Amino acid sequence: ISHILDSISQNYLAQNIARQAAQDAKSLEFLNQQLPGRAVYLQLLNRQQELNIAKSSAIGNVRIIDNAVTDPNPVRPKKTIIIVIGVVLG
Amino acid sequence: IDLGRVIGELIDHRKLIISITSVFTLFAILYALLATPIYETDALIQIEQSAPETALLQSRMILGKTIDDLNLQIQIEQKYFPVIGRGLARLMGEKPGNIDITRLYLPDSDDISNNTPSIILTVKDKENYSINSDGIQLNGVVGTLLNEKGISLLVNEIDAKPGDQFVITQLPRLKAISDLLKSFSVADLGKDTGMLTLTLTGDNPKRISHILDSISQNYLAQNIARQAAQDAKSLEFLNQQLPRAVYLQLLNRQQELNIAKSSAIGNVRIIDNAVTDPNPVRPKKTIIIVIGVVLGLIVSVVLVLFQVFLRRGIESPEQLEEIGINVYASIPISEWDTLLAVGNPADLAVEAIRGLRTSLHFAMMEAKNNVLMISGASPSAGMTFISSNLAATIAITGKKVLFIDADLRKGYAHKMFGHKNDKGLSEFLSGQAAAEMIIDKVEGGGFDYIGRGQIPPNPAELLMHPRFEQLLNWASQNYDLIIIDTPPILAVTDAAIIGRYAGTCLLVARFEKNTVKEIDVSMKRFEQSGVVVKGCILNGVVKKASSYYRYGHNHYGYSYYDKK
Ligand SMILES: Nc1ncnc2c1ncn2[C@@H]1O[C@H](COP(=O)(O)OP(=O)(O)O)[C@@H](O)[C@H]1O
Ligand SMILES: [Mg+2]
């Protein structure tokens, strides 16, 4: 469960940075599909790199302060409340 | 009432309680098993709020687009003749047949009520099929479309077995939308987030996921399109406004608006495409069966609670003795035209009649004569059962007993003893028979008996004849005991006439059929006519736990024999 919670954290970490870039990635996606007067072609090249840098540097909103560790004491079953209820119910 | 009373009542009515509860649980289980399972699929939508988006998802514009895409106005239902044929077919492991229809145009009757025309498709094989709307039979084949009789139908990929029928309904577009809108719900799940949780329920697990995907995609296309439209409208005017430095400046704005429209991206977003939860959400079998048990119990309890508060019959001899009525015996029901005292002398009811025989030997002493009249309140209370068996238990003790069947109305003692039916008590009272010709011997008995004879038209007036007292005065010298069986006193007055010549009179009370006031009314009707009723005989007692808790004793009696 500690390996799973580490995977969930890292996937959400890798995924979150990607999400903010997704708005600029879709713009970059259509720009690459739209790369063919020449002065405008240079203006597109300036937008071409600006979308490359924005996507690459767009990592934010998620920080993992602590990695997953397992509490060695089980949370269930709660032996004391079970035995106590066993006495009282009996 | 207390704990013992109610627990005894529950023990006594345990058959009723168990049967009613089991019927309720059986109905609950049959519903939980035969009800069609309804699944639920969910998608997650994340808007870039989320208030106006909900009403646009549930609109007839978005939902109506899904009905057109998936042809949700073509309703196909497997044909099952009963209201349970679908559920049991699922239990038998039969996979439900499904046919894919891509084109359906019915003749559109559109009459006063049936705005939804319907046909019935009967699968003949994997390839061809039949159609019958109103008896008109039409043969169709997968592939080749059908345009006949004003009926357009295109069936693709019949996945079923031959013989299966299907009801194909072409419901109106609004009805298809209203059905979808009824099962389709939208939520926010955070009340602030841009997340929308689209859920959809239905009996088909695969179909509802295709529908929720169509709804989501349509909503996604529309949402993004609107954001795209603003930039498409500006780029539209730019294309309309292009007429050299400003021209190049507009060219930069030209592509900057091309990129935006191309990028698109609605504020709304999809994070999870629709998948169906394989566990049905309805019917909830556990809560249905549990309610079936609990509802069956509270119904069984109120019925038992009613029968307890409504019953008025006698429950124990104590009820009769609270009024001052001596109960000389309590005869149990004999579970065994025969005399019980002769057929089964060891019966528990004969053992109780022997206890009456010894109780009478002490009560019939100090009486005027040896004549014992046995009457009762209501018919079929056991007056003939007790008097005839009491005569049999006194006959084995070596006494001469005469059993007179003075029930000139419905007396059947002659049938119970073996009869020469001629010359009974009627023929004697009417003067057409001598006292010696009417006495007959019980074969397996030990006592003589006088039958009623032919039913007279005036039974109560015959018993008033002075011949009846002459017969009793004559028989009282040739017999040690005369037992007179009579009709019930609350029916006719015959017993009050006969009771004038009987030294001892006993009433027979039926266990649950007679009431305490009914027996008190009977004893006071005798006393009003000069007949002193010595006591009562409670008849037909059954073993009941309620009597053991209400009173200390159930008054049934114990079995005492050596088992061999
Ligand atoms: N304690 C009993 N046990 C078994 N059967 C009984 C008992 N009392 C009556 N019966 C039966 O129920 C019927 C009613 O008895 P019956 O003598 O005809 O009633 P009555 O003369 O009071 O109208 C009879 O067939 C009788 O055999
Ligand atoms: Mg009778």
How do the helices and strands line up, and which of them pair or pack?
The structure is cut from a larger assembly and holds 2 copies of chain A.
Chain A: H1 2-34, H2 38-57, H3 79-89
Helix pairs in contact in A: 1-2
The structure holds adenosine-5'-diphosphate and magnesium ion (MG).
Structural features, described:
Chain A: Belongs to the etk/wzc family. Chain A: It is found in: Cell inner membrane. The structure is cut from a larger assembly and holds two copies of chain A. Chain A has 90 residues and is mainly alpha-helical. In chain A, helix 1 runs antiparallel to helix 2. The interface between A and B is medium-sized, with 13 and 13 residues. The complex binds adenosine-5'-diphosphate and magnesium ion (MG). The site of adenosine-5'-diphosphate (ADP) has 14 residues of chain B, from helix 13 and strand 20.
The major pleated sheet of chain A works out as: none
Strand content of chain A: under 5%
**What oligomeric arrangement do these chains adopt?**
part of a larger assembly
Please estimate the helix content of chain A: over 70%
Shape descriptor of chain A: rod-shaped
The total of helices of chain A stands at 3
Bound small molecules, deduplicated: adenosine-5'-diphosphate, magnesium ion
Radius of gyration of chain A, whole Å: 26 Å
Main interface: chain pair and counts? A-B, 13 and 13 residues
Structural class of chain A: mainly alpha
Count of β-strands of chain A: 0
Q: How widely separated are the two ends of chain A?
A: 36 Å
Secondary-structure element pattern of chain A, one letter each? HHH
